[PDB]
Design a protein around this ligand. Structure first.
Ligand SMILES: [Cl-]
Ligand code: NA
Length: 382
């Protein structure tokens, strides 16, 4: 056996790390990207996984599957499946009580249990790991949300097995982010760690208590339908309105245009985490009309002000449920790229009366980082 890897199998993005020579290397994919969209797409000729899949969603919406994590371990009758299905452009069918995403692939109707979709994303993670390492990768730590029940964890293990991984352990994502920061290396009294996990699509606030390297999930809160994508969306609508004033065209119903605007907004959001201005640079957005514009950080925050403020409600709920005062949190760990947003960091630090956030590990890589650490331990190489 070679190096074991850690895999953040995320709702919208996935990430793989390897602990080598005393450090975690986050492994860039075949596109040079350190995270990989949790997307699989099926075309007339191929199965696309990750960036290729995400990049052609607007071209192929009904055969581009994402959010499999929302289905994994669930039954068709589940109210969550029923509700979510209402907003996916791919089909979800009932196979004798279990949901299957149904797509066209090489012109055939094909259906996949959620864990089959997820195994594909895990197969990608395994491949980019082997490409990077130049060695076989069999052993993996795979992460899941702390709220996952037995069915959801077993279904995630099933995904690993399908991908040919020996899944050393299913570990909670908040726990992974804590391990990444070495918060379980600590010796002594219980520490309460709030993981503020604002991903692309989901917002999770978890409070863990860690004592003697042992994790307890105290409470979980959040919004399963709030993420960075919601902020992108407020910019989309804003820029849709701007495009309409400047060009007197409404791009709303053009899915490709909206998608490329969305992508530009997603990059702008990212840019705006380090700079006060970001451009939207879209050649031929709509009817060949270019859209070169730009937005300030201030305007971005303004567009999203209620949603940013709203992230504090689950923090308060998590704290209520954990029976902890905000002052009893020892560590706030930021997970998810949206947590790089200066305004969110300021709202969070403000709520926590100035407390500095654990944010030194790329919030998007923190879970895989921790998973890679744990993998190296579970395989006996740390
Ligand atoms: Cl994600
Ligand atoms: Na993310």
């Amino acid at each position: 056996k070679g190096p074991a890897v850690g895999i953040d199998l995320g709702t919208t993005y996935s990430c793989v790390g390897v602990f080598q020579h005393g450090k975690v290397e986050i492994i860039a994919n075949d596109q040079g990207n350190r995270t990989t969209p949790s997307y699989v797409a099926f075309t007339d000729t191929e199965r696309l996984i990750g960036d290729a899949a995400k990049n052609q969603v607007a071209m192929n919406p009904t055969n581009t599957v994402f959010d499999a994590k929302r289905l994994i371990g669930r039954r068709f009758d589940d109210a969550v499946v029923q509700s979510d299905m209402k907003h996916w452009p791919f089909m979800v069918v009932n196979d004798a009580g279990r949901p299957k995403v149904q797509v066209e692939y090489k012109g055939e109707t094909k259906s996949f249990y959620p864990e089959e979709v997820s195994s594909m994303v895990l197969t990608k993670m395994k491949e980019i790991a082997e490409a990077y390492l130049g060695k076989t990768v069999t052993n993996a730590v795979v992460t899941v949300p702390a709220y996952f029940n037995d069915s959801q964890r077993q279904a995630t293990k099933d995904a690993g097995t399908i991908a040919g991984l020996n899944v050393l352990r299913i570990i909670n994502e908040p726990t992974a982010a804590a391990i990444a920061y070495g918060l379980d290396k600590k010796v002594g009294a219980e520490r309460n760690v709030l993981i503020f996990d604002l991903g692309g699509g989901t917002f999770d606030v978890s409070i863990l208590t860690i004592e003697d390297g042992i994790f307890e999930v105290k409470s979980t809160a959040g919004d399963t339908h709030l993420g960075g994508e919601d902020f992108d969306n407020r910019m989309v609508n804003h820029f849709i309105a701007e495009f309409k004033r400047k060009h007197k065209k409404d791009i709303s119903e053009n899915k490709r245009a909206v998608r490329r605007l969305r992508t530009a907004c997603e990059r702008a959001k990212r840019t705006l985490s380090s700079s006060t201005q970001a451009s939207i640079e879209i050649d031929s957005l709509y009817e060949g009309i270019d859209f070169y514009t730009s937005i300030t950080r201030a305007r971005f925050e303004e567009l999203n002000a209620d949603l940013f403020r709203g992230t504090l409600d689950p923090v308060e709920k998590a704290l209520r449920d954990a029976k902890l005062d905000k002052s009893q949190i020892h560590d706030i760990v930021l997970v998810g790229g949206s947590t790089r947003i200066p305004k969110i960091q300021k709202l969070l630090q403000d709520f926590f009366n100035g407390k500095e956030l654990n944010k030194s590990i790329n919030p998007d890589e923190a879970v895989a980082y921790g998973a890679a650490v744990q993998a190296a331990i579970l395989s006996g190489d740390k």
